[PDB]
Amino acid sequence: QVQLLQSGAAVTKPGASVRVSCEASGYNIRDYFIHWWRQAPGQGLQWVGWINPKTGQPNNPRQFQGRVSLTRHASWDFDTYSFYMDLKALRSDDTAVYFCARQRSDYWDFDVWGSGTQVTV
Amino acid sequence: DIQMTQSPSSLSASVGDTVTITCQANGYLNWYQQRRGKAPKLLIYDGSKLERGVPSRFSGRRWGQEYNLTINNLQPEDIATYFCQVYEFVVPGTRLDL
Amino acid sequence: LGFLGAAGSTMGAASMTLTVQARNLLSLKLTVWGIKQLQARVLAVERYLRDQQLLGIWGCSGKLICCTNVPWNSSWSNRNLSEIWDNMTWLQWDKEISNYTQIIYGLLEESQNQQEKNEQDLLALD
Amino acid sequence: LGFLGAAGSTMGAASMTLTVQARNLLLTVWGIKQLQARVLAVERYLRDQQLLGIWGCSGKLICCTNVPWNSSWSNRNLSEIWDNMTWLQWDKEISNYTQIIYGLLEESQNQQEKNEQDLLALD
Amino acid sequence: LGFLGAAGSTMGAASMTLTVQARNLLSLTVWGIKQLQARVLAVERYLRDQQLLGIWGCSGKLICCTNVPWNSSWSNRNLSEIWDNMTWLQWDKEISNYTQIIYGLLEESQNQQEKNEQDLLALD
Amino acid sequence: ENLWVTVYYGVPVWKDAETTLFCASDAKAYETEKHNVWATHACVPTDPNPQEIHLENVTEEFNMWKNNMVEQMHTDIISLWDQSLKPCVKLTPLCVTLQCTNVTNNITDDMRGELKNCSFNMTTELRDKKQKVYSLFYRLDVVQINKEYRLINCNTSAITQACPKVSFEPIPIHYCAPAGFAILKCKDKKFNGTGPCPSVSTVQCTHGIKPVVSTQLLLNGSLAEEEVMIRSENITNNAKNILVQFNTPVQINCTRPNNNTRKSIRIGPGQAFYATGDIIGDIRQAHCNVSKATWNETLGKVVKQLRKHFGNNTIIRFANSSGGDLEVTTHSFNCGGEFFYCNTSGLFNSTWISNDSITLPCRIKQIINMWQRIGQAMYAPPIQGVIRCVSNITGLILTRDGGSTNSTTETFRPGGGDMRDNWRSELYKYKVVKIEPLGVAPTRCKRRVV
Amino acid sequence: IRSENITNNAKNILVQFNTPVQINCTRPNNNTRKSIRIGPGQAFYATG
Amino acid sequence: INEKEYRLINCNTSAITQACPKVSFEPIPIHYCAPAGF
Amino acid sequence: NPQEIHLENVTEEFNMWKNNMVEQMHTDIISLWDQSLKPCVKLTPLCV
Ligand SMILES: *[C@@H]1O[C@H](CO)[C@@H](O[C@@H]2O[C@H](CO)[C@@H](O[C@@H]3O[C@H](CO[C@H]4O[C@H](CO[C@H]5O[C@H](CO)[C@@H](O)[C@H](O)[C@@H]5O)[C@@H](O)[C@H](O[C@H]5O[C@H](CO)[C@@H](O)[C@H](O)[C@@H]5O)[C@@H]4O)[C@@H](O)[C@H](O[C@H]4O[C@H](CO)[C@@H](O)[C@H](O)[C@@H]4O)[C@@H]3O)[C@H](O)[C@H]2NC(C)=O)[C@H](O)[C@H]1NC(C)=O
Ligand SMILES: *[C@@H]1O[C@H](CO)[C@@H](O[C@@H]2O[C@H](CO)[C@@H](O[C@@H]3O[C@H](CO[C@H]4O[C@H](CO)[C@@H](O)[C@H](O)[C@@H]4O)[C@@H](O)[C@H](O[C@H]4O[C@H](CO)[C@@H](O)[C@H](O)[C@@H]4O[C@H]4O[C@H](CO)[C@@H](O)[C@H](O)[C@@H]4O)[C@@H]3O)[C@H](O)[C@H]2NC(C)=O)[C@H](O)[C@H]1NC(C)=O
Ligand SMILES: *[C@@H]1O[C@H](CO)[C@@H](O[C@@H]2O[C@H](CO)[C@@H](O[C@@H]3O[C@H](CO[C@H]4O[C@H](CO)[C@@H](O)[C@H](O)[C@@H]4O)[C@@H](O)[C@H](O[C@H]4O[C@H](CO)[C@@H](O)[C@H](O)[C@@H]4O)[C@@H]3O)[C@H](O)[C@H]2NC(C)=O)[C@H](O)[C@H]1NC(C)=O
Ligand SMILES: *[C@@H]1O[C@H](CO)[C@@H](O[C@@H]2O[C@H](CO)[C@@H](O[C@@H]3O[C@H](CO)[C@@H](O)[C@H](O)[C@@H]3O)[C@H](O)[C@H]2NC(C)=O)[C@H](O)[C@H]1NC(C)=O
Ligand SMILES: *[C@@H]1O[C@H](CO)[C@@H](O[C@@H]2O[C@H](CO)[C@@H](O[C@@H]3O[C@H](CO)[C@@H](O)[C@H](O)[C@@H]3O)[C@H](O)[C@H]2NC(C)=O)[C@H](O)[C@H]1NC(C)=O
Ligand SMILES: *[C@@H]1O[C@H](CO)[C@@H](O[C@@H]2O[C@H](CO)[C@@H](O)[C@H](O)[C@H]2NC(C)=O)[C@H](O)[C@H]1NC(C)=O
Ligand SMILES: *[C@@H]1O[C@H](CO)[C@@H](O[C@@H]2O[C@H](CO)[C@@H](O)[C@H](O)[C@H]2NC(C)=O)[C@H](O)[C@H]1NC(C)=O
Ligand SMILES: *[C@@H]1O[C@H](CO)[C@@H](O[C@@H]2O[C@H](CO)[C@@H](O)[C@H](O)[C@H]2NC(C)=O)[C@H](O)[C@H]1NC(C)=O
Ligand SMILES: *[C@@H]1O[C@H](CO)[C@@H](O[C@@H]2O[C@H](CO)[C@@H](O)[C@H](O)[C@H]2NC(C)=O)[C@H](O)[C@H]1NC(C)=O
Ligand SMILES: *[C@@H]1O[C@H](CO)[C@@H](O[C@@H]2O[C@H](CO)[C@@H](O)[C@H](O)[C@H]2NC(C)=O)[C@H](O)[C@H]1NC(C)=O
Ligand SMILES: *[C@@H]1O[C@H](CO)[C@@H](O[C@@H]2O[C@H](CO)[C@@H](O)[C@H](O)[C@H]2NC(C)=O)[C@H](O)[C@H]1NC(C)=O
Ligand SMILES: *[C@@H]1O[C@H](CO)[C@@H](O[C@@H]2O[C@H](CO)[C@@H](O)[C@H](O)[C@H]2NC(C)=O)[C@H](O)[C@H]1NC(C)=O
Ligand SMILES: *[C@@H]1O[C@H](CO)[C@@H](O[C@@H]2O[C@H](CO)[C@@H](O)[C@H](O)[C@H]2NC(C)=O)[C@H](O)[C@H]1NC(C)=O
Ligand SMILES: *[C@@H]1O[C@H](CO)[C@@H](O[C@@H]2O[C@H](CO)[C@@H](O)[C@H](O)[C@H]2NC(C)=O)[C@H](O)[C@H]1NC(C)=O
Ligand SMILES: *[C@@H]1O[C@H](CO)[C@@H](O[C@@H]2O[C@H](CO)[C@@H](O)[C@H](O)[C@H]2NC(C)=O)[C@H](O)[C@H]1NC(C)=O
Ligand SMILES: *[C@@H]1O[C@H](CO)[C@@H](O)[C@H](O)[C@H]1NC(C)=O
Ligand SMILES: *[C@@H]1O[C@H](CO)[C@@H](O)[C@H](O)[C@H]1NC(C)=O
Ligand SMILES: *[C@@H]1O[C@H](CO)[C@@H](O)[C@H](O)[C@H]1NC(C)=O
Ligand SMILES: *[C@@H]1O[C@H](CO)[C@@H](O)[C@H](O)[C@H]1NC(C)=O
């Protein structure tokens, strides 16, 4: 099953750290970038970042610097992976759907996404 | 750099209408669609070819920075928001109505 | 002259270097470097030998220049032959006739060499 | 016009296909076997060409040696052979004598021909 | 009659065996590995000689006449003094420091030029 | 009168093609000692005259990041590494739990807890006996089991180590085309990684290239010929690594100031195991030095080049890495036969606007997982004595932060640690083609009638 | 019907059908599997 | 083992393996030949 | 029955101990010795 697993919705009081996650699926994870996206309700989708799972290496916009990080993990037999997004400073405008995506190509085709989750503050 | 714009707003078109939406951007363009409560879906990629499993009704065109997307014979199950995308920037969604 | 110096020459002028070009066409132990060298040596032989086979078919064996009598449809080129000899490199020429080479090879084999053998058989009757 | 189509015709008629027949002559376990196969093909090809070069018949599908043969090897009219036997059938008859023939080709005509050619060239 | 019997005779007499000597020029255990190396090497060397003959136009012959004069300094014997009394091996030793020169001469002084002349003849 | 097509041979023809590259090393000079990890026990010696010629009137297309010579290097180097790895002792006896303490010897106080002294009852030359032995370890190579510790990789594929005699010093390697194929090189000093090159030459073999391994900055590569170069497969794709090539060397000095000592034990017959000896003297951190001025001025030179791809007077900034696996979080290299990691973030603490030395802390881990691979692990042997290293920094592997607005205030970080792009910095200059001597053209002649 | 020699009872008789004969086969149990670690880095599997 | 316990003489040297019982060590003549062209 | 050929009027140097035929045998034999033993079971339990 090529589809990504997606963690459930959650709510916290403002200023809280928060974590969300996704999981590996039958495609070889090592060969593709993981991307995160977020969307405010009533608004167009916003890119959050990407991580190269082979190196554990995140890339984020200046806007989110020092607020978020991306991490990844894998089964000791390497048939699974986990991905996480951490935010250390919730604010009411951080309420958004959040989700994972796969960079299929160098044209950034995204033919798969996690269902996403709803983070609220 | 990124020059993206879009003009579709929303459309009221009737069922069975072939319809189109357009946008313009520097570089490669991918087209997507989304429905509330659901993940977005790829329709067109690399400025051209349809994503696999996209209905034959879907099509599009590229010239210069111009990009076109169309749906032949539009149907109510096809109502969705739509997008134009470049590696990071995304035009705000536009949508079908009827 | 160095190998491939002829690439700047006109096609007619390149003929002077054909011998030079031909000079290098041919030339645990389980350590991977040795394995790689072995494969390379075999491949080079295969390709070299293959060309020689074709020349023997064409009757042009033993020559860098040969003179077939086979006619060609003029449409294959847009230029007078003297124009061809001095207005292009052979690389350019290859592109000009890139889709006819299979045709040519079959013709060389049968239109002239198979037929000439038949003509020599007629002489062999005496 | 298929490969080996000459098997359906007399050996005299088989001459028409000789140009066809020559056309195709040229760390997993399979990779090892592949290598051996490639080498084998080269060896057989070269060995045959070597003989033709000795015989002076190189570069020709058909050649004309000056060596006479002892008719006892096959006492038939040439038309009685070429219009009847497949090349293979005739081959079976002449298979045994072939080493005789090869030695004759090498010396009775070609080694001495080359000597005579030089002698001619002296003048 | 035996292979390399010519080592016992003069260069002129050696001509008689040239065909003979030509006959055998071409014909996971480690021995199999070594065998493949031998097979490849033999082919490679055989072809190198053939390549030179093809350039020289000497292909298909054990004897090939050429148009190349040689500088007399390379040897100092009456022609009969070599052919009628020298083992070919001895002759190799005398010629051995000039062979590179000779090969270059063969390639172009006559063969590259002759091929051009052949085209010029066929031109008319 | 009508022309007839006829045969020619030895005509130059080029086709893009790929074949396996020849091994080569200069005069097999490695043969004087045994033995180099990549030269192995044998390679082909280089030609005494690796001649090249400029082609008259020729230009040629090149495609950096498309050439598969690089890919061959990727798997050839890996294969070589394993080839020397395979004939060695497994360390799986060392998965037994170890007791430890934070032993010191006049330790500086910024080194505290970086070393541990630990022990176990091992194995002995006879199955019926055990003995207690201890050795120093870097904290990085252990994890508390739940103080008691286990080697960090015991929940991963087995650790091995033997054959310390092999040299990990790089030796240049040259590659040569198979007969009937040829190496072409771009002669333009300013060439873009892709597209046609206005001047070309061809050569019997490539210039030698050392098997350098580093993860943030290129070391000991070729200098840019005239000016600092910046290249990307597509600059607007920020998933792509940004090549930076210096046109001058930058000296760097690196040391491991501690005197190092070594001991060995026998796990069983034939099973020697190297282990760290107790270290004599004051304990001090590994470090390196680079000039302040040189780093600054050459960084500004990079910026001047960088501006060529952006609107005038754009703001430019450098930054500390965004984190990830240690191999890219810090700069890493091997020197002296021992691995090093360092905090390079101080080098990136700058911003740029329109219009005498630095020292860096370092770390050592002896358990290594090569490249991105997780199927193998190895223990570096201890290196006796103080380590001294000197090298020239020749470039950077950089990445660019995504997003932002109005095409301004671009920022950068170290990244790109996949080894393939170290090799690309040297191989972008070359392509290989297939020679096809055969060809035809019309003639006024006909074969003679016979 | 083929054999090396039909009268030889040391030899197998081949039978080649000139038509297919369908067969369906199943393992009706719903199975699960457990990962096991034995050697370091050495997965092992066992039936759940 | 000490100055009695015993151990194989090579336990302080590289490990011992057993020859397989099924293959003879008897000499057999071996012949060699030239590669072609030699 | 290989065919020995006695040369007429020939002599040649045979410089013993410069021949590497011997050296090849030296390592050919050793290599075979290893190949025969590589399949064989290890005795390391006997260090008890
Ligand atoms: C990095 O990533 C970017 C992001 O995508 C990627 O994008 C390319 O960017 C480069 C340079 O910026 C482009 O190269 C040029 O693109 C021009 C636009 O191409 C299109 O327009 C064609 C018609 O153009 C004429 O008319 C228009 C106005 O109507 C006018 O703007 C133009 O200037 C021009 O006058 C059109 O034919 C073409 O589509 C055809 O061709 C493609 C095949 O390439 C095929 O798929 C289509 O179906 C169709 O048949 C297209 O829509 C173009 O004008 C320009 O042409 C000139 O320059 C080149 C050399 O620079 C000459 O060879 C040529 O004769 C002209 O002089 C040139 O091709 C490139 O096209 C972008 N990519 C795409 C997909 O469009 C970069 O490639 C990436 N770079 C790297 C290094 O990785
Ligand atoms: C960037 O590129 C530069 C330039 O190529 C490169 O610099 C050189 O790096 C190497 C590796 O770090 C350095 O090589 C070491 O140098 C020391 C000193 O050598 C000099 O002095 C000796 C006498 O001491 C002279 O004989 C010699 O010619 C030199 O002038 C050597 O001591 C090192 O060799 C030891 O290790 C070898 C195995 O790798 C052994 O074969 C050898 O016998 C030596 O071992 C001995 O000492 C050990 C303890 O110190 C001991 O444990 C052993 O048992 C044994 O007794 C080695 O060659 C070289 O000097 C650097 N050059 C300069 C200018 O500094 C960088 O390496 C490079 N960076 C990258 C990432 O590749
Ligand atoms: C790239 O560069 C950046 C900045 O230069 C680095 O980010 C900083 O890294 C340091 C060390 O990794 C961080 O500091 C450490 O934080 C730990 C916890 O801090 C939180 O909790 C404390 C109270 O416990 C609050 O005061 C503080 O605000 C935090 O909320 C501390 O536990 C650490 O202290 C311990 O270790 C230090 C030595 O390192 C000892 O001196 C102490 O006595 C104590 O034992 C320490 O302070 C710092 O917070 C990071 N910055 C940010 C913004 O997160 C990156 O690490 C670097 N990149 C990489 C890959 O390393
Ligand atoms: C090999 O096993 C080790 C543990 O023995 C694994 O490393 C540990 O992995 C977890 C998950 O990434 C880390 O957990 C984190 O720990 C901190 C502190 O306890 C806690 O704050 C976090 O919430 C989280 O649980 C743990 O720190 C890390 N240990 C170390 C030494 O880094 C490793 O993943 C294992 N490898 C395999 C292939 O499973
Ligand atoms: C990198 O260069 C730095 C200097 O830029 C070197 O640091 C210097 O190292 C020496 C040796 O550790 C220190 O010297 C000692 O200082 C004390 C007090 O001054 C004195 O008591 C000792 O006799 C001795 O001189 C020196 O202070 C230190 N400098 C600073 C700024 O800390 C370092 O050695 C260099 N590394 C390389 C590999 O050369
Ligand atoms: C995108 O498709 C639209 C139709 O959906 C095209 O619209 C025509 O565009 C041209 C140029 O602006 C006008 O001359 C026509 O009058 C437009 N038609 C209508 C219905 O308004 C447009 O040409 C398409 N673009 C591409 C590149 O093919
Ligand atoms: C030994 O070598 C000499 C010359 O090196 C050969 O001498 C010839 O012998 C024959 C018959 O005995 C005479 O007909 C010739 O006049 C001799 N001289 C020559 C040819 O120069 C002799 O044949 C060689 N022996 C063998 C067995 O080959
Ligand atoms: C060395 O072996 C001794 C036993 O000979 C181990 O000591 C026992 O260790 C376990 C685990 O800590 C305790 O349950 C026992 O009570 C200890 N015995 C005594 C006598 O204290 C020790 O663990 C061994 N060390 C190594 C590294 O395995
Ligand atoms: C460090 O870099 C410098 C400059 O690139 C190197 O010095 C050059 O060395 C080469 C070969 O020895 C000379 O041909 C150059 O002329 C030198 N440069 C100058 C400016 O004169 C130096 O060799 C490099 N370090 C090492 C260890 O190779
Ligand atoms: C690295 O360290 C070495 C020595 O610790 C430095 O080499 C000296 O450099 C100075 C400055 O040019 C010279 O005057 C000395 O003669 C050099 N020493 C020797 C023994 O040759 C080197 O400059 C340092 N590099 C950096 C970038 O700091
Ligand atoms: C590591 O710990 C061991 C014991 O746990 C220390 O071993 C002692 O070492 C000193 C000096 O080498 C000797 O005088 C003692 O006799 C040793 N004790 C035993 C029981 O063997 C060792 O010194 C420690 N090493 C470090 C660097 O702290
Ligand atoms: C790597 O470098 C960065 C700075 O370039 C270090 O960040 C420092 O963190 C320490 C401890 O939290 C503070 O004392 C410093 O003030 C920070 N630097 C600055 C400029 O503010 C980081 O800790 C370094 N990592 C290591 C392991 O040394
Ligand atoms: C590391 O330190 C040790 C000892 O602290 C040094 O060993 C000395 O070596 C010299 C010459 O080989 C001897 O004359 C001394 O007697 C040794 N010292 C002792 C205490 O025995 C060693 O040389 C140092 N490492 C380096 C690279 O210099
Ligand atoms: C094996 O089982 C399958 C299904 O269990 C049988 O497939 C049926 O085939 C017929 C003939 O086309 C269809 O009409 C049925 O609808 C199929 N069944 C199903 C459930 O799809 C098949 O015939 C069986 N074969 C044998 C030899 O028993
Ligand atoms: C094989 O076929 C048989 C019947 O043809 C299947 O058995 C039936 O099983 C169902 C439920 O298990 C019962 O309700 C029926 O009464 C059974 N049929 C008979 C004739 O007893 C069986 O499931 C098939 N198995 C497979 C693997 O195809
Ligand atoms: C081809 O001949 C035409 C005249 O027939 C002439 O105009 C042109 O220059 C010629 N080209 C060559 C290469 O001579
Ligand atoms: C088959 O043989 C007969 C005579 O033997 C002849 O009539 C016929 O042409 C042959 N067929 C072919 C295909 O050669
Ligand atoms: C060959 O001659 C024999 C009689 O000697 C005869 O039977 C056969 O028909 C002849 N073949 C030819 C083609 O005439
Ligand atoms: C060759 O000349 C030498 C003197 O140089 C002489 O002794 C011998 O008779 C000469 N041979 C010929 C055939 O004249």
Given CB atoms, is E26 within the 8 Å cutoff of chain C?
Answer: no
Are F117 and F135 in contact by the 8 Å Cβ rule? The answer is yes
HEC secondary structure over chain F: CCCEEEEECCCCCEEECCCCCECCEHHHHHHHCCCECCCCCCCCECCCCCCEEECCCCCEEEECCCCCHHHHHHHHHHHHHHHHHCCCCECHHHHCCEEEECCCCCECCCCCCCEEEEEECCCCCCCCCCCCEEEEEEHHHEEECCCEEEECCCCCCCEECCCCCCECCCCCECCECCCCEEEEEECCCCCCCEEEECCEEEECECCCECCCCECCEEECCCCCCCCCEEECCCCCCCCCCEEEEEEEEEEEEEEECCCCCEEEEECCCCCEEEEECCCCCCECCCEEEEEHHHHHHHHHHHHHHHHHHCCCCCCEEECCCCCCCHHHHCEEEEECCEEEEECCHHHHCCEECCCCEEEEEEECCCEECCCCCCCCEEECCCCCCCEEEEEEEEEEEEEECCCCCCCCCEEEEECCCCCHHHHHHHHCCEEEEEECCCEEEEECCCCCCC
DSSP label of I26: H
Of A33, A30, A21, A10, whose CA–CA distance to A96 is shortest? A10
For residue H11, what is the nearest residue in chain F, using CA coordinates? F269
Q: Which two tokens stand for residue F75?
A: 């798997």
Closest atom of ligand 9 relative to the F251 alpha carbon: 1
Q: Does B68 contact ligand 6 (Cβ within 6 A)?
A: yes
Q: How is chain C split among helix, strand and coil, in percent rounded to 5?
A: 65, 0, 35
| B4, B45, B83, B89, best to mutate vs chain A, most A CBs in 10 Å | B45
Question: Residue C56: phi, psi to the nearest 5?
Answer: -65, -35
Closest CA to F288 of F368, F343, F345, F365: F343
Residue D24 backbone phi and psi in degrees, to 5: -100, 15
Domain boundaries, chain B: 1-98
What's the alpha-carbon Rg for chain D, to the nearest Å? 19
Q: Where are the domains of chain F?
A: 9-446
Q: How many domains does chain A have?
A: 1
CB-based contact B84:B4 (threshold 8 Å): yes
Identity at B92, one-letter amino acid code? P
Superfamily of domain F9-446: Human immunodeficiency virus 1, Gp160, envelope glycoprotein (2.170.40.20)
Encoded amino acid at F328, one letter: V
User: Is the Cβ atom of G22 under 6 angstroms away from ligand 14?
Assistant: yes
Whole-angstrom distance, CA of residue F318 vs CA of residue F232:
18
Q: Technique behind this structure? A: cryo-EM
C-alpha F349/C-alpha F317 separation (Å) is 8
Please report, for the domain that includes residue A120, its CATH number: 2.60.40.10
Q: What is the resolution of this structure in A?
A: 4.3
Atom of ligand 6 nearest to the CA of B70: 5
What the block records as the tokens of E73 is: 């300094």
Q: Which residue shows structure tokens 């998965």?
A: F95
Contact F401, A59 (CB under 8 A): yes
What is the Å distance from ligand 2's center to F336 Cα?
7
What type of residue sits at position F179?
Answer: A
- Whether G41 and chain F come into contact, CB under 8 Å, resolves to yes
Determine the residue among D21, D50, D60 to mutate to test chain C binding: the one whose Cβ has the most chain C Cβ atoms within 10 Å: D60
Give the integer Cα–Cα distance in Å for F74 and F206: 17
Domain at B1-98: CATH architecture:
Sandwich (2.60)
Question: Quick one: tokens of E31?
Answer: 């021995």
